[PDB]
């Protein structure tokens, strides 16, 4: 009853991954793709982040899920739960319980770039819900959504405001593509962190424990290990900023001094100037009405909207137009 499909394993997929890292490192303003945070070490660092006092999103969303999962399941009526950027799927157990309770649960399809997190969560869920079929998919949710099985009536969930780690142009492409993988009867549950006080927003990405910093820097450890690079992690400092124009948090890594870095697997040497900054992640924060309009543009209609009392975070349920 357990399966794993691995689409990131192909050299065709590897080439695209490496091409995107190369483009980031060779652009006039440097960047790295957010997906490279998530090797085994990074997946655990994010798990640490979810427990920080500063990082309100996980517990806020979990509280909405704890109190609204029945409602969500009743509206979706799905027998199949698809989770994008699933990670450890800890919040997802609330959804799985509610589907099981409703006597609908037949299948769980976790989808992640990290196959380790898939094998762990997959084996766990497989045991916690005997008789369920598990179809783990290792892929890039910007490239491999078409590989998610079309079986049954599906609730696709994208929690944790991961959607905000895409800038508006690829975000629109992603949502349009996602919409086009949905069949009649399918649903999207989307978590979106909302615009709020920016002290709160910036602190959630710049905790006093240094955890987010370590998580940010680890992207250099991943590149170092996997692409034969020689970034000096000590040479770069974590920077979190509020971009008010784009209404998004931005994580940067800034060079303390001039750095000269080879990435051997890419046949690539790059340099940083003193004080030069590299963009490692964006975290877009949303206004409620813009979420409605973004879904609509993609060909999706918001049918349900749930928020916490303080309006820190929203969950949307959407169907095809």
Residues at the binding site for L-histidine are 55, 165, 205, 281-283
Helix ranges (H only) for 77-161 are: 92-101, 115-128
Strand order in the sheet with 236-243: 236-243, 248-255, 277-284
Binding residues for ligand SAH, rule CB under 6 A, total 20
Instruction: State the DSSP code for 142.
Output: T
| Binds 122: which of ligand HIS, ligand SAH, none (CB < 5-8 Å by kind) | none
Pick what 212 binds: ligand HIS, ligand SAH, none; C-beta below 5 to 8 Å, kind-dependent: ligand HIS
Strands 277-284 and 248-255, by their bridges, are antiparallel
Stretch that binds ligand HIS, among 61-69, 134-142, 161-169, 225-233 (CB under 6 A): 161-169
Residues of the binding site: 55, 85, 91, 112, 140-141, 165, 205, 281-283
Sign of CA dihedral 139, 35, 202, 167: negative
Can residue 85 be called a binding residue for ligand SAH (CB under 6 A)?
Answer: yes
Residues 216-235 that bind ligand SAH (CB under 6 A): none
Question: Residue 129 burial (CB < 10 Å; 0-12/13-18/19+)?
Answer: middle
φ/ψ of 135, rounded to 5, equals: -115, 85
Q: Which of 24, 110, 160, 314 binds ligand SAH (CB under 6 A)?
A: 160
Minimum separation from the CB atom of position 234 to ligand SAH (A): 25
Q: How many CB atoms lie within 10 A of CB 77?
A: 13
Between 76 and 148, CB nearer to ligand SAH: 148
Closest approach, Cβ 249 to ligand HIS, in A, equals 7
* 87 in contact with ligand SAH (CB under 6 A): yes
Give whichever of 211 and 270 is closer to ligand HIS, judged by the CB atom: 211
CB 238 within 8 A of CB 255: no
Helices (H), 134-260: 168-181, 198-203, 211-227
Q: Which residues bind ligand SAH (CB under 6 A)?
A: 34-35, 38, 43, 46, 50, 58, 85-87, 112-114, 117, 140-142, 159-160, 162
């Amino acid at each position: 009853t357990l399966s794993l499909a691995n689409y990131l394993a192909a050299d065709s997929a590897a080439e695209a991954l490496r091409r995107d890292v190369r483009a980031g490192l060779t652009a006039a303003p440097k960047s790295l793709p957010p997906k490279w945070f998530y090797d085994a070490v990074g997946s655990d660092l994010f798990d640490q982040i979810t427990r920080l006092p500063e990082y309100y999103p996980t517990r806020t969303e979990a509280q909405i899920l704890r109190t609204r999962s029945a409602e969500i399941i009743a509206a979706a009526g799905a027998d199949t739960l698809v989770e994008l950027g699933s990670g450890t799927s800890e919040k997802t157990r609330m959804l799985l319980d509610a589907m099981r309770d409703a006597e609908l649960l037949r299948r769980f399809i976790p989808f992640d770039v990290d196959a380790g997190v898939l094998r762990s969560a997959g084996a766990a869920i497989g045991a916690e819900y005997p008789g369920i079929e598990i179809d783990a998919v290792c892929g890039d949710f910007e490239e491999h959504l078409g590989k998610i099985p079309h079986v049954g009536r599906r609730l696709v969930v994208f929690l944790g405001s991961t959607i905000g780690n895409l800038t508006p142009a690829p975000r629109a492409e992603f949502l349009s593509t996602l919409a086009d993988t949905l069949q009649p009867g399918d649903s999207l549950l989307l978590g979106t962190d909302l615009v709020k006080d920016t002290g709160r927003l910036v602190r959630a990405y710049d905790d006093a424990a240094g955890v987010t910093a370590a998580f940010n820097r680890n992207v250099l450890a991943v590149v170092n290990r996997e692409l034969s690079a020689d970034f000096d992690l000590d040479a770069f400092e974590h920077v979190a900023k509020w971009n008010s124009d784009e209404e998004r948090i931005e994580m940067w890594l800034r060079a303390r001094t001039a750095q000269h870095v080879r990435v051997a697997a890419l046949d690539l040497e790059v340099d940083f100037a003193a004080g030069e900054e590299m963009l490692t992640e964006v975290s877009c924060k949303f206004r409620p009405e813009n979420v409605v309009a973004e879904l609509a543009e993609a060909g999706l209609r918001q049918t349900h909207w749930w928020t916490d009392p303080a309006g820190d975070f929203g969950l949307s349920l959407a169907v095809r137009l």
